[PDB]
Amino acid sequence: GAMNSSNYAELFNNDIKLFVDDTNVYRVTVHKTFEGNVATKAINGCIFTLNPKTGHLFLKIIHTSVWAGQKRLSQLAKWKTAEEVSALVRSLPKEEQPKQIIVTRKAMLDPLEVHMLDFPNIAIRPTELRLPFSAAMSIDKLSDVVMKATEPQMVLFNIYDDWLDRISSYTAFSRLTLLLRALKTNEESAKMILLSDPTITIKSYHLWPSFTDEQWITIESQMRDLILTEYGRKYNV
Amino acid sequence: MNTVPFTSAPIEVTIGIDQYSFNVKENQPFHGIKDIPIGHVHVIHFQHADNSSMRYGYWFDCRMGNFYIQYDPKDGLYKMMEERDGAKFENIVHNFKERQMMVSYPKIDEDDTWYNLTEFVQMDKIRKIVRKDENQFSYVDSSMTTVQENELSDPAHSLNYTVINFKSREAIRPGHEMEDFLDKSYYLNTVMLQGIFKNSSNYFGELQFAFLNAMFFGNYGSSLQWHAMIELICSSATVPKHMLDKLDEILYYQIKTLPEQYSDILLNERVWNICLYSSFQKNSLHNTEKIMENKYPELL
Ligand SMILES: CNCC(=O)N(C)c1ccccn1
């Protein structure tokens, strides 16, 4: 059944599972035409498929050519997502295939279930959590590889960098979701927090800066402040 | 015109014959039903006064044998049986006829309701859905589950309707996932019509039989089957024009006949709203849409 606050630690047990987020698959800019009508222009997108225990991110880049000559693109995007997730699963050795796939949006349930009919033992689940994975394109290195792609491409990342050498996967996921929630609520502020101190750099093979344990506590506090504030600024409190 | 005699009526019971019904009192000198139209299947059905639980009954065709009803005090129900001695049967019926204890199947001459509800229903197909090969007639009751319900527990007593499942490998061609799920024409026309049912008449017959078991016995799995077979047609973009026209007539007469007060349980809101207002065939069921809107606008 659905994943929620009550069964949260299940994410960090030893049953392989993946989150799939489709919110950045079909992306457009909306603009005026010379005749003064409105049109859209697609830009490259991505499927966000994440193992929350290990941090392994399977970033399937969706190049705009996949939309050429197609209709009802927002519907197609869900089915394209499910096609690519099913292909990923089939590409993995049996012992690496997930036992559950959790979709962040309920409209992915039927597309994914249908594409995974060959895998009756893989549970496809929704979630009641409001996860901030749409903000993945606010991570500079992820946005860069998506925007530069000239063809369909899969790129592999660990979204936890080396954090698991020092913290558990529960704590790493909590840090990830805090960072992403902040980037979603106020991207400029969030990014200012992460980079204000030029002596803390991002390793070439990492996504986030090389904070010490003590610096992560300061950073994490600053992201909470931001979120509560924006929550005031937004609601006036 | 054929006859189904009753040995007696030892317990108070409401007796149905097709869309008609009589309340028989405990030990009411009553001895069966005459003037039953030849050429159609028929259903004789029962609800005891002391236990409105379990409606049950028998599908039959008088061309296939001489059938009668006899109460069994051990099993506690009215049982259909075949009389193989034809002279014994004619003699019984004639005596019963002279005693004026046999009700006359009360068909109005103008009235094509039963034909319209059973147009494609054949006894031979009923007997493959309801498996009990030593009898020529078929028992159904309120509690019997379908083969598909059992999958999700006694198989001898199951309704072996054709399994329809929209999220199944049978329904979905590898590589056409989105196409086959959003437009079920492949599944309707190739898998089901050409493959399993062979023709639309057999498909409609199973649909009509499922409705009738839903209506007369409150059989929940039958209701599920009826709606699935409707939904499979309505969710196909490509349906033969003769099938859509016949479907509209079939459904019109089903909706017309349904008891006004059972609509809440026998009609699935999602399927009907999808079929009449969203599906590919939303504009192909004019008669059905008009009667639904005028009789059950709440559901919609
Ligand atoms: C529901 N009446 C059953 C019936 O036809 N019979 C028993 C009868 C007919 C005429 C007068 C009395 N009984």
Residue B36 Cα to ligand 1 middle (Å): 16
Measuring CA to CA, which residue among B13, B22, B132 is closest to residue B82? B132
CA distance B87 to B75: 29
The type of residue at B97 is K
Residue for token pair 């527990």: B153
Whether A70 and A153 share a structural domain:
yes
**Residue A235 structure tokens:** 């609601």
Based on the domain organization, do A148 and A53 belong to the same domain? yes
Residues of A in contact with B169 (CB under 8 A): 117-118
Q: CB of B16 within 8 A of CB of B216? A: yes
In sequence order, which residues have a C-beta less than 8 Å from that of residue B5 and are 6 or more positions away? B31, B32, B68, B69, B89, B92, B93, B96, B102
Of B300, B285, B281, B277, the closest CA to residue B254 belongs to B285
Same domain flag for A34 and A115: yes
Going from the Cα of B24 to the center of ligand 1, the distance in angstroms, rounded, reads 9
What are the residues whose beta carbons fall under 8 Å from the beta carbon of B92, sequence distance 6 or more? B5, B68, B83
Backbone angles phi, psi at A199, to 5 degrees: -75, -15
Helix, strand, coil content of chain B in percent (nearest 5): 45, 20, 40
Give a yes or no: residue A4 inside a domain.
no
- Kindly tell me the number of DSSP H helices and DSSP E strands found in chain B: 12, 10
- For residue B261 and ligand 1, the question of a CB distance below 6 A is answered with no
Residue closest to B191 by CA, chosen among B218, B161, B163, B223: B163
Q: What stretches of B55-101 show up as alpha helix (H) in DSSP?
A: 86-98
Residue from B4, B103, B105 to probe ligand 1 pocket by mutation (most atoms less than 8 Å from CB) = B103
Q: Which residue of B has its CA nearest to A79?
A: B178
Token pair in block for residue A9: 């630690």
In-domain check, residue A14: yes
Task: Return the ∠ at Cα A165 (arms to A164 and A168), rounded to 5°.
Answer: 40
Tell me the CA distances in angstroms from A230 to A57, A189, A236, one per residue in order: 29, 10, 9
Euclidean distance between CA atoms B258 and B245, whole angstroms: 21
Give the domain extent around B221. Answer: 116-299
Give the total residue count for chain B: 300
Query: Does the beta carbon of B22 sit less than 6 angstroms from any atom of ligand 1?
Result: yes
**Is A46:A136 a contact under the CB 8 Å cutoff?**
yes
Domain count, chain A: 2
Residue B5, strand partner residues: B32
Residues A179, A139, single domain; the answer is no
Helices (H), B158-285: 177-182, 185, 200-217, 220-234, 241-257, 263-266, 269-273
Q: Is A215 found in the same domain as A118? A: no
Residue A97 tokens read as 């295939």
Distances (CA, A) of B296 to A33, A187, B250: 47, 52, 17
Are the beta carbons of B204 and B120 closer than 8 angstroms? Answer: yes
Domain coverage including residue A89 = 9-163
Residue A3 lies in a domain: no
Q: Are strands B13-17 and B42-48 parallel, antiparallel or unpaired?
A: antiparallel
| Solving technique | X-ray
The pair of structure tokens assigned to B232 is 């499979």
| Tokens found for residue B30 | 């009553």
Beta sheet of B32-36, edge-to-edge order:
B2-5, B32-36, B103-104
- CB-nearest to B167 from A82, A83, A113 is A113
List residues in chain B touching A: CB distance below 8 A: 167-169, 172, 177-178, 181
Q: Is residue B126 within 8 Å of B160, Cβ to Cβ?
A: no
Other Cβ atoms less than 10 A from the Cβ of B19: the count is 16
Residue with the smallest CA separation from ligand 1 atom 8 is: B101
The SS3 assignment for A13 reads coil
Strands B103-104 and B32-36: parallel
Which DSSP symbol is given to B291?
H
d(CA B158, CA B130): 7
DSSP of A119-188, one letter per residue?
Answer: -TTSEEE-BSS---GGGGGGSHHHHHHHHH-SS-EEEEEETTTTGGGTS-HHHHHHHHHHHHHHHHH-HH
Identity of the residue numbered A71: K
Question: What CATH number is given to the structural domain containing A184?
Answer: 1.20.80.40
Residues A82, B177: C-beta atoms closer than 8 Å: yes
The pairing of strands A56-62 and A45-50 is antiparallel
